[PDB]
């Protein structure tokens, strides 16, 4: 995807799992990849900006800082995988709010402050990823299911409001092999390598593809929707789910 | 609906418009109606309880109270800058979560429990977002609590409500003829060549709350005059 | 429904099961019911007209006849190798097109015309295909004919019908205990821990055909016990 | 997309519009492109097989013939653009059946006879394209809307039945600049270059993108879904519609 080369791409958390796979892809494409998270992902091919995306003030500044640097913002990839930080475990009513903070409001803040700069740039597209926790098991997954659907609605607003200047799309993954899913397995069956393997195999057979997805497979869809190859695709969710939703 | 009679039905924000018409509809049906809002109207037809649904304390208290009075809850109707944005998500979404969270235990033990969430409508952002959130909320509740309790969503388009009457009034002027023309024109966006009536929403809510919809759950009913039929 | 009484309602393939229960439901509602099927039952409650809905000649003739008898049609209920495949698309789809095509002109001039299409269920191919086709058919009709006429779809999952009773019977044996176990097990695929009842479908059809759904069009109502709530 | 190189790809009609753009793409990818239609598309980079896809017997043989040749069938792209042949113009009741023949049954025949051979091959994916006529204007577009939805259902069956061996997906285009759409404009406003231009501009403003799509833009989605990049995507429709459906 030659068009992605040198475009400024912000991934919100690029240390592990999906965020990492995404980050990897755009680097192979030749982007200026910026990592908006609370952790430096170690690799010196991405540039990290210290920010808690649930805090609007931190997002506001961080975005402006990013724009003073690379003088451009093309792609905004909103994603939440192991930056849902607190006590988890279970809890409930404060936990319900915090999951909505991370999985919805972090998407709104990053979007509200990026849009004004993005429209100034070339081929701006925003790609929103649903939580992997959406289809798994009710610890109490209601907040995940809710903020996934919320994120669709958000995607659809942005799409409609900012066409034809800027594009917006959602990627909706099923269960993907990530630190987040490995944790869910562990909370269900403990920390035995075989038992976690067996459980993950079991979740795989829930999908008609008879396996769970790979982060690389969600990286592809994001790259595609952010690419010029998707220049007429906007306001939609692309299901990367191994045919779970059918 | 021969089952709705003497069923306990909580209707949030049942003050005017869509909330009025739904409240009034169950009252027509022989049901015992309780309004959970901040603003109390005049009444003899149905109960009222002062309750800001974005306050979980008040919510919990109010539903506990309701159950102590009636010994039953069969139906719950949840009805609709960054501060303003976060406020809309609080009202349109967090309100539905709090009332649901607290009513459910009581509802699991009552006859034919049914939850019905109404969706809502410069930047329509927080409205659209929360509409979809409510669908997600409906789906998860309906998943977690079947076969004990049913949960469904009504997704109305443009309905003749005071809100919408004003939304035209801001755009063209307070002239009741130009507003009429603006309303008529919005009606033509709908394949049905007209906007909706509050009664027409109240019908769907009453259907989904009754035993008539006993096998229907986790679904949205579009009272939109074909607006989504695209 | 105070409007369904003495309304003219055509119900195709209203012989047994889902078609039985829908026919019977309108008869309960004070409506005047006419069955369009190939096989006639015993009756005094509702009319029958011998009509193979996959034959456009017979269809046209039959609806013309119906209108000449009653001077009105308000409701139409369309109810469900390569040869076999093409035969299913003919029944489940082409049948709905022919009855709709011919009834519509008559319906546009009757009180509150409403069309309701029921979806259906080795290779489930032609069934699934035609289910979606019917949704498309519903949508286009509802688009073309608003605000004159409403058209909507009922999408039922597994319902206790003779068909399904047999579909278990082929798989495990004709033993009425193993069939029961096979049915109970299919019920647990549904979040509601049970398959559906024909009455529960008949309820949705009667709702969508009545004035209660006056602003609802081009939509599918899922009577599936949460099966699609995935 | 290196994985597409040398894979056997059958496009059902590759002379003009979308079918052509598709055909072009996979050739740039390095495929063995086979054209199943009733017209030779002229270009000696595709190989043509004479077949009316609405006739099961012709499809049955043609497919087998194709498999004896290239000994493999990887991709099946079902598409219908100006091979809807008869009198059009309008008509109705026989026209309604014939549109269903072309837009639905041609997809079923090509699929029924390809699947048994496709599963034997590497990374088999079927990509079904909805009619461009779906969203335009009721001459009587009911048959188009119906067979579009029918094609979704078909896609979903195949997906579920043949996972994980074979994948199936739908691409759902809005109005795309094709001979089919240019004809629709012409039937509405006559054969004046300006009037057809104006009308097409008007249809463009119906889409939030303020323009109608390009065949190349539908080519991309097909290439992507047929590609290994979509190896976990199955049973879904990817809307290439400029945000019309939102």
Report the residue from D230, D240, D246 with minimal CB separation from A159: D246
In terms of Cβ atoms closer than 10 Å to its own Cβ (0-12, 13-18, 19+), residue A51 is buried
Question: Do A126 and A111 meet the contact criterion of CB atoms below 8 Å apart?
Answer: yes
Which CATH number is C1-230 given?
3.40.50.720
| Contact between chains at D209 and A230 (C-beta distance less than 8 A) | no
Question: Do A37 and A101 meet the contact criterion of CB atoms below 8 Å apart?
Answer: no
Classify residue B176 by its DSSP letter.
Answer: T
> How large is the C-alpha radius of gyration of chain D?
17
Domain D1-246 part of CATH 3.90.1170.30: no
Q: Token pair 């309602």 is at which residue? A: C9
Question: Do C168 and C179 meet the contact criterion of CB atoms below 8 Å apart?
Answer: yes
Q: What is the C-alpha separation between D8 and D21, in angstroms, rounded?
A: 17
Question: Do D243 and D212 meet the contact criterion of CB atoms below 8 Å apart?
Answer: no
The Cα-based distances of A144 to A83, A100, A240, B137 in angstroms read 14, 8, 17, 9
Question: Do C140 and B220 meet the contact criterion of CB atoms below 8 Å apart?
Answer: no
The Cα-based distances of A118 to A36, B225, C118 in angstroms read 16, 36, 47
In terms of Cβ atoms closer than 10 Å to its own Cβ (0-12, 13-18, 19+), residue D90 is exposed
> How large is the C-alpha radius of gyration of chain A?
17
**Cα angle at B201 between B200 and B202, to 5 degrees?**
90
| Contact between chains at B212 and C207 (C-beta distance less than 8 A) | yes
Q: What is the C-alpha separation between A219 and A228, in angstroms, rounded?
A: 16
**Cα angle at B87 between B85 and B91, to 5 degrees?**
120
Q: What is the C-alpha separation between A149 and B132, in angstroms, rounded?
A: 5
Give the 3-state secondary structure of residue C221: strand
Q: Count other Cβ atoms within 10 Å, centred on residue D92.
A: 12
For residue D225, what is the nearest residue in chain A, using CA coordinates? Answer: A221
Q: What is the C-alpha separation between D74 and D77, in angstroms, rounded?
A: 10
For residue B101, what is the nearest residue in chain A, using CA coordinates? Answer: A93
Report the residue from B139, B197, B222 with minimal CB separation from C219: B222
- C47-50 and C75-78 as β-strands: parallel, antiparallel, unpaired? unpaired
Q: Which residues of B touch C (CB under 8 A)?
A: 139, 142-143, 146-147, 190-194, 196-197, 200-201, 203-204, 207, 212-219, 221-226, 228-229
The Cα-based distances of A153 to A192, B83, C200, D54 in angstroms read 39, 19, 32, 40
Query: Resolution in A for the shown PDB structure?
Result: 2.7
Q: Is B53 annotated as a binding residue?
A: yes
Q: Which residues of A touch B (CB under 8 A)?
A: 56, 93, 96-97, 100, 104-105, 108-109, 112, 138, 140-142, 145-150, 152-154, 156-158, 161
Q: Token pair 């190349």 is at which residue? A: D216
One DSSP character per residue, chain D reads -GGGTT-EEEES--SSHHHHHHHHHHHHHT-EEEEEESS--S-TTSEEEE--TTSHHHHHHHHHHHHHHHS---EEEE--SS---S--S---HHHHHHHHIIIIIHHHHHHHHHHHHHTTSSS-EEEEEPPGGGSS--SSTHHHHHHHHHHHHHHHHHHHHHTTT-EEEEEEE-SBSSHHHHHHHHHHH-S-HHHHHHHHHHHHTTSTTSS-B-HHHHHHHHHHHHSGGGTT--S-EEEESTT---
Report the residue from C94, C125, C139 with minimal CB separation from D145: C139
Give the 3-state secondary structure of residue B127: helix
Q: Which residues of C touch B (CB under 8 A)?
A: 139, 142-143, 146-147, 190-194, 196-197, 200-201, 203-204, 207, 212-219, 221-226, 228-229
- A47-50 and B75-78 as β-strands: parallel, antiparallel, unpaired? unpaired
Q: What is the C-alpha separation between A93 and B97, in angstroms, rounded?
A: 10
**Residue B148, phi then psi, degrees to nearest 5:** -70, -45
Ramachandran bin of C226, using left for φ above 0, alpha for ψ from -120 to 50, beta for the remaining angles: left
Name which of A89, A100, A82 is nearest A186 in CA terms.
A89
Round to the nearest angstrom and report the end-to-end CA distance of chain D.
30
H/E segment holding residue B88: helix B82-89
Q: Is B128 annotated as a binding residue?
A: no
Q: Count other Cβ atoms within 10 Å, centred on residue D30.
A: 13
Give the 3-state secondary structure of residue C211: helix
Q: Is B161 annotated as a binding residue?
A: yes
| Contact between chains at D163 and A220 (C-beta distance less than 8 A) | no
In terms of Cβ atoms closer than 10 Å to its own Cβ (0-12, 13-18, 19+), residue B228 is middle
Q: What is the C-alpha separation between C87 and C174, in angstroms, rounded?
A: 28
> Residues near A131 by Cβ (< 8 Å), separated by ≥ 6?
A80, A103, A144, A147, A148
Q: At what angle do helices D56-70 and D106-118 cross, to 10 degrees?
A: 30
Chain C residues with CB under 8 Å of B221 CB are 216, 219, 221
CA B74 to chain centre: 15
Name which of B115, B110, B107, B156 is nearest B139 in CA terms.
B115
Q: At what angle do helices A17-29 and A215-226 cross, to 10 degrees?
A: 50
Classify residue B213 by its DSSP letter.
Answer: G
Distance from CA of D16 to the nearest CA of C (A): 27
Q: What is the C-alpha separation between A241 and A218, in angstroms, rounded?
A: 9
Name which of D14, D16, D11, D13 is nearest D181 in CA terms.
D16
Q: Which two tokens stand for residue A100?
A: 């909505």
Distance from CA of C46 to the nearest CA of B (A): 23
Q: Which of A85, A144, A162, A239 is catalytic?
A: A144
Give the 3-state secondary structure of residue C5: coil
Q: Which two tokens stand for residue C90?
A: 């003919």
> Residues near D54 by Cβ (< 8 Å), separated by ≥ 6?
D101, D102, D105, D106, D109
| Contact between chains at B193 and C217 (C-beta distance less than 8 A) | no
Strand ranges across the sheet with A32-37: A47-50, A32-37, A8-11, A75-78, A125-129, A167-173, A237-240
Give the 3-state secondary structure of residue B200: helix
Helices (H) and strands (E) in chain C, counts: 8, 7
In terms of Cβ atoms closer than 10 Å to its own Cβ (0-12, 13-18, 19+), residue B42 is exposed
Report the residue from A93, A109, A154 with minimal CB separation from B129: A154
Residues forming a β-bridge with C150: C114
Q: What is the C-alpha separation between C86 and C126, in angstroms, rounded?
A: 8
Q: Is C52 annotated as a binding residue?
A: yes
Chain A residues with CB under 8 Å of B85 CB are 108
Q: How is chain D split into domains, by residue range?
A: 1-246
Distance from CA of C85 to the nearest CA of D (A): 10
> Residues near A162 by Cβ (< 8 Å), separated by ≥ 6?
A115, A119, A168
Report the residue from D56, D146, D157 with minimal CB separation from C128: D157
Q: What is the C-alpha separation between C178 and D26, in angstroms, rounded?
A: 53
Q: Is A55 annotated as a binding residue?
A: no
Q: Token pair 């599936």 is at which residue? A: C224
CA C60 to chain centre: 19
Q: What is the C-alpha separation between A234 and D190, in angstroms, rounded?
A: 32
Q: Give all chains having 3 or more CB-to-CB distances under 8 Å with chain C.
A: B, D
**Residue C10, phi then psi, degrees to nearest 5:** -85, 130
The Cα-based distances of C225 to C182, C188, C194 in angstroms read 17, 10, 8
**Residue D177, phi then psi, degrees to nearest 5:** -65, 100
Residues forming a β-bridge with D33: D9
Q: What is the C-alpha separation between B140 and B150, in angstroms, rounded?
A: 11
Q: What is the C-alpha separation between D33 and D9, in angstroms, rounded?
A: 5
3-state SS of chain A is: CHHHCCCEEEECCCCCHHHHHHHHHHHHHCCEEEEEECCCCCCCCCEEEECCCCCHHHHHHHHHHHHHHHCCCCEEEECCCCCCCCCCCCCCHHHHHHHHHHHHHHHHHHHHHHHHHHCCCCCCEEEEECCHHHCCCCCCCHHHHHHHHHHHHHHHHHHHHHCCCCEEEEEEECCECCHHHHHHHHHHHCCCHHHHHHHHHHHHCCCCCCCCECHHHHHHHHHHHHCHHHCCCCCCEEEECCCCCC
- The verdict on whether A144 is a catalytic residue reads yes
Q: What is the C-alpha separation between D126 and D73, in angstroms, rounded?
A: 10
Q: What is the C-alpha separation between D39 and D17, in angstroms, rounded?
A: 14
Examine residue D4 and say whether the peptide bond preceding it is cis (omega within 30 degrees of 0): no
**Residue B153, phi then psi, degrees to nearest 5:** -125, 140
| Contact between chains at C129 and D56 (C-beta distance less than 8 A) | no
Q: Which of C46, C106, C127, C222 is catalytic?
A: C127
Q: Is A243 annotated as a binding residue?
A: no
> How large is the C-alpha radius of gyration of chain B?
17
Q: What is the C-alpha separation between D152 and D28, in angstroms, rounded?
A: 28
């Amino acid at each position: 995807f030659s068009d992605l080369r040198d475009k400024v791409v912000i991934v919100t958390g690029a240390s592990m799992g999906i965020g990492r796979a995404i980050a990897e892809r755009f680097v192979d494409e030749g982007s200026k990849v910026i990592d908006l998270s609370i952790h430096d992902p170690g690799e010196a091919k991405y540039d990290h900006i210290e920010c808690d995306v649930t805090n609007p003030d931190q997002v506001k500044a961080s975005i402006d800082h990013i724009f003073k640097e690379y003088g451009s913002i093309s792609v905004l990839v909103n994603n939440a995988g192991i930056e849902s930080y607190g006590k988890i475990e279970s809890m409930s009513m404060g936990e319900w709010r915090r999951i909505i903070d991370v999985n919805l409001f972090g998407y709104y803040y990053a979007s509200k402050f990026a849009i004004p700069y993005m429209i100034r740039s070339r081929d701006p597209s925003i790609v929103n990823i649903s939580s992997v926790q959406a289809s798994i098991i009710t610890k109490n997954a209601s907040a995940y299911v809710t903020s996934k659907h919320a994120v669709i609605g958000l995607t659809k607003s942005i799409a409609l409001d900012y066409a034809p200047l800027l594009r917006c799309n959602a990627v909706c993954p099923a269960t993907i092999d990530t630190p987040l899913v490995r944790k869910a397995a562990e909370l269900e069956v403990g920390s035995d390598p075989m038992r976690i393997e067996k459980k993950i195999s079991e979740w795989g057979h829930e999908h008609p593809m008879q396996r769970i997805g790979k982060p690389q497979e969600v990286a592809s869809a994001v790259a595609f929707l952010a690419s010029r190859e998707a220049s007429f695709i906007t306001g939609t969710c692309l299901y990367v789910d191994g045919g779970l939703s059918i």
